[PDB]
Design a protein around this nucleic acid. Structure first.
Length: 48
RNA sequence: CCCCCCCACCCACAAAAACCACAACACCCACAAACCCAAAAAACCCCACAACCCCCCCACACCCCACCAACCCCACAAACCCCACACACCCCACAAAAC
């Protein structure tokens, strides 16, 4: 529900969960990142 | 894979020993303005005709199975240590030796 997701966000203070970052990195890295793509942004932003 | 004697650091003139030293120096820094190897706009899946979307299919079929006799890349026999003449048998031995 929108309400459930919003409360989940609020509980973490509007901060990404570790699993969120892990998933984002896993998707971005195992992809041929195009120049200004969302993939490139995800790789550059969330890494090590 | 010891030796010539004397000898016996692949030591040595003096002066001396940083492969230090003109001075000025001392980022293998620096032209300014500036200081993303950004920017026209419109855009922004290296998406898209449509039908379609197994690099699926004729059918019969479907062990890259099958003639049977068969089926150890067994066998003549005699045999069967890639064993033997004796003499023998350290790839020992002149002597002197024998780092």
């Amino acid at each position: 529900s929108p309400e459930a997701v919003y409360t989940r966000i609020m509980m973490n203070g509007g901060r990404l969960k570790r699993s969120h970052i892990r998933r984002y990195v896993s998707v971005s890295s195992n992809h041929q990142a195009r120049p200004n793509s969302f993939a490139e942004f995800l790789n550059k932003t969330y890494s090590s």
